[PDB]
């Protein structure tokens, strides 16, 4: 219910409260064990990082991958694509923005 | 201790203002407050201190030789 609601908070901007809808599911599907697969749990984590990039907070994105409590050992190609977007926001260059576009195009696009 | 002070509401603020006015001027000892009553029942930590009632002087009934001096 929060994942379907968090999508409605995308085109409406206001990403401050949109991260709570996505973070509520991460700990919810984590305790489901077999009920969640590897690919389904990977897409849920991508929603949290995508909401923070729209909110423009660099420190909160680095705390997700660095801290094991926030990461819970979930990593893939599409997850690393969100890190390249956050690094391109500080330097403000479209070269690194389109760099991860072609390589990660499978999962990213 | 009760909540029935609604009828005593005028009496309640009487003792409250007494504590307030005695704290206004602490440099004047020439204003004396004396209360002559039958006995003491309800106490208070606010009533016992400087500038207020402190020494309790009992007024018992006169003794054998005391009534002889009064009548004389």
């Amino acid at each position: 219910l929060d994942l379907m609601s968090g999508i409605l908070h995308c085109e409406d901007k206001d990403y401050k409260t949109a991260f709570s809808y996505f973070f509520e599911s991460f700990e919810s599907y984590h305790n489901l064990t077999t009920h969640n697969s590897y690919e389904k749990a990977c897409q849920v984590l991508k929603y949290m990082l995508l909401s923070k990039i729209m909110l423009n907070l660099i420190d909160d994105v680095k705390n997700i991958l660095n801290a094991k409590y926030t990461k819970e050992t979930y990593q893939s190609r599409g997850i690393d694509a969100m890190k390249a977007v956050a690094e391109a926001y500080n330097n403000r260059s479209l070269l690194d923005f389109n760099t991860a576009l072609k390589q990660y195009e499978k999962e990213l696009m | 201790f009760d909540s029935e002070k609604s009828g005593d509401r005028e009496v309640q603020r009487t003792m409250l203002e007494l504590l307030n006015q005695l704290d206004g001027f602490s440099s004047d000892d020439r204003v004396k407050v004396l209360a002559a009553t039958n006995r003491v029942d309800v106490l208070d930590p606010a009533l016992l201190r400087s500038g207020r009632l402190d020494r309790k002087i009992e007024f018992p009934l006169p003794s054998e030789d005391s009534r002889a001096q009064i009548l004389q």
């Binding site: - | 609604s6 603020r13 606010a46 016992l48």
Partner: protein, 252 residues
């Protein structure tokens, strides 16, 4: 103020907390604007009436030097046109126009309280004062540098709407002072009383339990009458033990 912060000793546990939530935000409010927080507005100090209440009232304004606004509960409830309304509003405006102002309330149980059934029979003045205090704080005009100190007999008998955060953020009990804190008090009021150099200040601390500057003056009253009987201009260190022991029987 006429009473500094050295005569309120024994409350130093609370004194360290009160100075940081009152003296610190009043002298330098600009430190909170950088973080984005808000300082508390009111400070609720309850306890037994008459003990340390008069001292802490003048002690807050002494370490500051601002104006001391005293609000007696007797004059708050009267029969007039707009009585308690004009008292709080003009005080609210006088605190905004003049920043160095400290408001102190004494015995708010008369103007407060839950009563019994929460009905009103000649009770309209109780709700008149309480509703105005809560409405001025949550409005679009707050008090940044203004501190309001309230006192009552019991905290549980007041309005729970005020105790919630957003208006009154400070609830602090006033218990009896410790033994090490009553030594500094006994060196102040007794200093004005003429005595000798052999006077022992450690005689009372053993027999004193929760005796502030108000209770020690009763010991000086009994010691002042003793100097006339013995034809002396001072008192012996034994007069301190006999005077505190008499007070310890009536008090705690």
């Amino acid at each position: 103020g006429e009473i500094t912060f050295d005569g309120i000793g024994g409350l130093t546990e609370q004194i360290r907390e009160l100075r940081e939530v009152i003296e610190l935000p009043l002298k330098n409010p600009e430190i909170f604007q950088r973080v984005g927080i808000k300082p508390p507005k009111g400070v609720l100090l309850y306890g037994p009436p008459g003990t340390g209440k008069t001292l802490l009232a003048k002690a807050v304004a002494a370490t500051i030097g601002a104006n001391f606004i005293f609000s007696p509960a007797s004059g708050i409830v009267d029969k007039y046109i707009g009585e308690s309304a004009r008292i709080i509003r003009e005080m609210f405006a006088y605190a905004k126009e003049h920043e160095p102002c400290i408001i102190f309330m004494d015995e708010v149980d008369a103007i407060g309280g839950r009563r019994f059934s929460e009905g009103t029979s000649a009770d309209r003045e109780i709700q008149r004062t309480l509703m105005e205090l809560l409405t001025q704080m949550d409005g679009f005009d707050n008090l940044g540098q203004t501190k309001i100190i309230m006192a009552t007999n019991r905290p549980d008998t007041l309005d729970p709407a005020l105790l919630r955060p957003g208006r009154l953020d400070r609830k602090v009990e006033i218990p009896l002072p410790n033994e090490a804190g009553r030594l500094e008090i006994f060196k102040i009021h007794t200093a004005k009383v003429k005595k000798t150099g052999e006077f022992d200040f450690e005689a009372a601390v053993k027999m004193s339990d929760g005796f502030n500057g108000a209770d020690i003056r009763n010991c000086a009253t009994e010691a002042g009458f003793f100097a006339i009987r013995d034809d002396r201009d001072h008192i012996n260190p034994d007069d301190l033990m006999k005077a505190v022991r008499k007070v310890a029987e009536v008090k705690k």
